[PDB]
Amino acid sequence: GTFLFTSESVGEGHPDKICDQISDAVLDAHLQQDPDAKVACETVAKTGMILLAGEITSRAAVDYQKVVREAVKHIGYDDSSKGFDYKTCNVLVALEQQSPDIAQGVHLDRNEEDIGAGDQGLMFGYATDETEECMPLTIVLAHKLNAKLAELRRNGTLPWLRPDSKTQVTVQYMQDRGAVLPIRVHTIVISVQHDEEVCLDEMRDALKEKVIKAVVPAKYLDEDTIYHLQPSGRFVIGGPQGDAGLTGRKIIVDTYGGWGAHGGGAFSGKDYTKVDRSAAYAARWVAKSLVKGGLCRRVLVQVSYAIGVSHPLSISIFHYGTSQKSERELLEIVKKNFDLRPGVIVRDLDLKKPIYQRTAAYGHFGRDSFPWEVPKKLKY
Amino acid sequence: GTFLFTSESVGEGHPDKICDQISDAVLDAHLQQDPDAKVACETVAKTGMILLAGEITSRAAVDYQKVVREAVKHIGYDDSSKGFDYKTCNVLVALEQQSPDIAQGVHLDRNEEDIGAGDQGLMFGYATDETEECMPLTIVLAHKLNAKLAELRRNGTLPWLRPDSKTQVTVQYMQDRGAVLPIRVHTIVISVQHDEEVCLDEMRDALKEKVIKAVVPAKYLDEDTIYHLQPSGRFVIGGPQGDAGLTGRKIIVDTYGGWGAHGGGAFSGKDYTKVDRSAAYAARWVAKSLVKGGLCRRVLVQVSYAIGVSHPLSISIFHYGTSQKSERELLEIVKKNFDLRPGVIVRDLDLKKPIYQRTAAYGHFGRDSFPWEVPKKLKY
Ligand SMILES: C[S@@+](CC[C@H](N)C(=O)[O-])C[C@H]1O[C@@H](n2cnc3c(N)ncnc32)[C@H](O)[C@@H]1O
Ligand SMILES: C[S@@+](CC[C@H](N)C(=O)[O-])C[C@H]1O[C@@H](n2cnc3c(N)ncnc32)[C@H](O)[C@@H]1O
Ligand SMILES: Cn1cc2c(n1)c(=O)n(-c1cccnc1C1CC1)c1cc(Cl)c(F)cc21
Ligand SMILES: Cn1cc2c(n1)c(=O)n(-c1cccnc1C1CC1)c1cc(Cl)c(F)cc21
Ligand SMILES: [Cl-]
Ligand SMILES: [Cl-]
Ligand SMILES: [Cl-]
Ligand SMILES: [Cl-]
Ligand SMILES: [Cl-]
Ligand SMILES: [Cl-]
Ligand SMILES: [Cl-]
Ligand SMILES: [Cl-]
Ligand SMILES: [Cl-]
Ligand SMILES: [Cl-]
Ligand code: NA
Numbered sequence A, B: 001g002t003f004l005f006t007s008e009s010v011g012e013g014h015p016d017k018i019c020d021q022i023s024d025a026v027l028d029a030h031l032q033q034d035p036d037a038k039v040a041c042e043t044v045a046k047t048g049m050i051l052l053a054g055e056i057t058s059r060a061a062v063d064y065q066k067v068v069r070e071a072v073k074h075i076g077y078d079d080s081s082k083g084f085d086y087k088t089c090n091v092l093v094a095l096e097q098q099s100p101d102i103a104q105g106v107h108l109d110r111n112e113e114d115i116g117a118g119d120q121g122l123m124f125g126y127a128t129d130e131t132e133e134c135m136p137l138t139i140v141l142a143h144k145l146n147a148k149l150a151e152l153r154r155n156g157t158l159p160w161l162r163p164d165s166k167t168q169v170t171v172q173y174m175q176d177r178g179a180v181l182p183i184r185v186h187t188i189v190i191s192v193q194h195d196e197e198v199c200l201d202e203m204r205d206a207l208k209e210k211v212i213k214a215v216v217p218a219k220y221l222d223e224d225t226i227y228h229l230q231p232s233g234r235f236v237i238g239g240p241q242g243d244a245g246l247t248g249r250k251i252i253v254d255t256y257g258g259w260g261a262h263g264g265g266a267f268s269g270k271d272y273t274k275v276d277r278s279a280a281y282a283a284r285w286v287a288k289s290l291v292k293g294g295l296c297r298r299v300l301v302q303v304s305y306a307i308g309v310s311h312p313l314s315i316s317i318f319h320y321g322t323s324q325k326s327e328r329e330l331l332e333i334v335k336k337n338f339d340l341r342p343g344v345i346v347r348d349l350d351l352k353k354p355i356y357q358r359t360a361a362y363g364h365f366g367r368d369s370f371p372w373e374v375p376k377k378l379k380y
């Protein structure tokens, strides 16, 4: 009855994640001045370069140089010795207005509640009772390992650390009538950018003693746990210099770590009219509401949209055998309790508020009591 | 027992898909001269611009201007009236060598069979007996609708069509002991870029009569089927001008349309040492081999890797209740029949051959009898 499952996470200075954070810094900067900004901001990062590309229609006056460089500063790339420096990098901007054809089909002259979806697409929400925050343990631990690295970098404990990191956690699980129960950690991977001087033994010792042991409960670690710490042997070159980054290339890190399902859409750089983000947040909210409401132990929700149409085209529920209600009954409960038009989701989840940069590392779900993490009390 | 499920696909001129095709045109150009090229080529597209960014170490001499422009030509963007022109667009190149630190940790001085994974990560394979090609009907139909649009554009039947398109198909399914059985098509969305002159009624009529009816069997369509054809009302601006594109932003279109699972990695622009591609292809091959071998009706396979390590860190099987063998027994069969080291996958699936551009539209799976689509005969 046991099985393995693996999830990964990345750090704030991973080049794809840099792009997500910059895209959302740009979104937040617009929303701070114009709550109704239409934003579709892609970021690309390579050696010495941040490029913004996409479509923004907004009444805001945004200093892109400042916004980008402050985001990079926060991440920690502040010197050529680290491979990237917010003070001296190139920031290039290829931003246009939103297509008039999209605007007229989605939101022009439409009542806010009746705004069309900003695109077609499909989105999923997932929740699992295996952790109190209703997330898979694999992905929670992977995120926390990256957060620990950033903490020990910033507090000067491990000053050889640089911002670019990746982690991966394999858990051995058992099953209990469709719910999943973590037993032990089977394998951990950590790769993190480092300075020229520190040796591989010093790093591996610190990663086990100061990172893994500070994050993963000892009850999950045993003599058989496999550790792959700095498995490449050398990671001095990192950030965008080591690997080009793009917005929306960590969509599984951003969500459920391979559990559940994904419809393909990226979150960062997009305002609420882009259902790739708003409907995925709403679907998480639905899933978490069903689990915290005691209807399910685990649940997957699909929704889908057509551009220009407000109501979803389909809604589907899968409960993994963890409810005494049928999936049809759960669907009826969802339909009675939630309105998944984007122009209603925006009100319920307060999606004009400029909090998006906070979402763009360490996963969008399972932390900080964002509105989509606060369950709805269900009537049925 | 019935449920809905939705998948989408996009056309060759969708701006994200343009990027995937260009990335793989670049990969193929390298492989044609240097089978061992190390390629990590990201493409970004916006009005008037193709940018290549990433890392290539290769003995090839590649004319990026020519490769990019020929790919755009093939797609059909050949005039400013269409919003993009291969003859006159900007092609910018920000390509460096592969990081020496990665190279030394992955492949330098290593026997080919024992090459390390080019990164950490997780990957899934999926197969379902609901179609002969072992793919979900939702995603197959969505792809075929885009292919039909391109066919009728290219043959001059519907000369108002432009290359940028999206489709979405919702199927109503029943379940049979874990297998899924399509009943009917519930909803179809088609959005396609068009010329200034054609009206909405002409387009909607053609999309139903010449596209949908030419693709979707009549047995699946009924009086209740919902059609959202050109739902935005106007789609003259399109391609990169309408929406910035990036490589690796259609990873669910590229795979199983939301079915199965995804580990997050993009395929296009990457040589075989990048397990995001090679191990996903191998996992598809495993899944399809289990279904075509009569062991399962449906199956999901997870694998995972650490950078620099050749053997997978974990392998997992889920059969949805569609095998008389346990998941543990299936895992043993997989382990006895497959070697999922990247340096062995490359031999089994012939992954130095320059066929990658063909994979980069209409999905990587379920068509053309690529090596990962030819089942392995299993011993057990
Ligand atoms: C391995 S790189 C992807 C492959 C790369 N584009 C290439 O040219 O081979 C993906 C991520 O791994 C991490 N990485 C970069 N250099 C690394 C190294 N030397 N050792 C381990 N991980 C590294 C960074 O987080 C980077 O964004
Ligand atoms: C709707 S756009 C994404 C949102 C866009 N970035 C914005 O600024 O609102 C996503 C895709 O939809 C398609 N699209 C572009 N313009 C469209 C229109 N006027 N009507 C319908 N679909 C359109 C293209 O395939 C495009 O790549
Ligand atoms: C018989 N049956 C019904 C469904 C299903 N098979 C199935 O595979 N998925 C699905 C797709 C992707 C990932 N995970 C799952 C489910 C965990 C199996 C469904 C998803 C949804 Cl949202 C739904 F409502 C039904 C099924
Ligand atoms: C009790 N149990 C075992 C597994 C599981 N729950 C589960 O949710 N997934 C999973 C993850 C993502 C999408 N779809 C699925 C499966 C259709 C449920 C698994 C995947 C794999 Cl590859 C595996 F080997 C086991 C489970
Ligand atoms: Cl990566
Ligand atoms: Cl967008
Ligand atoms: Cl505005
Ligand atoms: Cl917990
Ligand atoms: Cl608690
Ligand atoms: Cl899109
Ligand atoms: Cl890569
Ligand atoms: Cl070479
Ligand atoms: Cl078939
Ligand atoms: Cl046949
Ligand atoms: Na998009």
Ligand code: NA
Pocket (backbone or CB within 6 Å): B119
């Ligand atoms: Na990558």
